[PDB]
Amino acid sequence: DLADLFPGFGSEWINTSSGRIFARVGGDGPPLLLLHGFPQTHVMWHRVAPKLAERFKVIVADLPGYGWSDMPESDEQHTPYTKRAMAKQLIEAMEQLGHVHFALAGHDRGARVSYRLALDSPGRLSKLAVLDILPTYEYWQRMNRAYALKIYHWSFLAQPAPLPENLLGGDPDFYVKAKLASWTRAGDLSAFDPRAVEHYRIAFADPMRRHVMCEDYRAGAYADFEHDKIDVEAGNKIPVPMLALWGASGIAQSAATPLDVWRKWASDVQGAPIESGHFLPEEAPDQTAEALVRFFSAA
């Protein structure tokens, strides 16, 4: 009995070459794609998407392999779960709806898809917002003792299969709830709608879904890092106007001052901290939504 947290939003299964993308679709106006991250699904947007749907055609997609999206089989390079591939697949998905130029906001892994999309295919984006991330390269480049402890899961989940999978399998509920809780400002589940938590827990309960998340992290440790490294060492910058939002108690600001980092990656970036842990649209829905509305509706 998973709750419908987007009342009045439609549901779309979008075929792509790499599998169907599930999305909730609501609103009208310029298209805005919202991408969640780990260990969540598209429902993390349920508190901000209605506000967004007042001004935008809001497409709230499950990432490839997450939620109700199909799970492409991975390979030794974790290709389908690299952000490059996810971006390409979501470009396909949006093209299926006739959106070849759209606004994009991503959180967490979804934000990594988003800035990778902006780097690979900037012509697809009108504007980009990334929530509580720095590029994957920067996390790895800032991987000292303190940060290795803080985001241990970057290296734990990237261990070769089936090591993370086997450990996660014993008590999946514990781990998904732990990560949800530990990255909030409060350190518990209070920020989350209980119905949303149930979506996250149910997705996490599927061993294939967990495997996909590890593949995501494996891509994050390897190919994603390599792709970022190429761009940063080539001085490739995102040319799409972008908003970097991060939680004052979130992960991004632990590594570095987020705006300074993003100004290295992006030629036109504005940013704002939000008093929030990592889960900006759930911990700080009003502030997050206002920031996104302000940013995306600015001409």
Q: 232 is written with which tokens?
A: 């940063």
Say which amino acid occupies 239: P
Binding to its own copies (CB under 8 A): which residues in 136-175? 140-141, 143-145, 148-149, 152, 154-156, 158-159, 162-163, 166-171, 174-175
153 is in an annotated binding site: yes
Total residues interacting with its own copies, rule: CB under 8 A: 26
Least spacing, CB of residue 22 vs its own copies, in Å: 28
3-state secondary structure of 84: helix
Q: How far is the CB of 181 from its own copies (least distance, A)?
A: 11
Q: Which is nearer to its own copies, 108 or 165 (CB)?
A: 165
User: Per the residue annotation, which of 62, 108, 132, 216 is the catalytic one?
Assistant: 108
CB under 8 Å to 102, separation ≥6 — which residues? 30, 31, 32, 33, 59, 94, 124, 125, 126
Residues 6 or more apart whose CB falls under 8 angstroms from that of 170 comprise: none
Footprint of its own copies on 215-234 (CB under 8 A): 221, 225
Residue 124 marked ligand-binding: no
**What residue has token string 């190919």?**
223
Torsion from C-alpha of 277, 282, 284, 290, nearest 10 degrees: 130
Residues numbered 175-204 forming contacts with its own copies, rule: CB under 8 A: 175, 178
The token pair at 283 is 């911990």
Q: Minimum CB separation from its own copies for residue 146, in Å?
A: 9
Question: Three-state SS for 253?
Answer: helix
The question of whether 211 is a catalytic residue gets the answer no
Interface with its own copies (CB under 8 A): 140-141, 143-145, 148-149, 152, 154-156, 158-159, 162-163, 166-171, 174-175, 178, 221, 225
> What are the catalytic residues?
108, 278
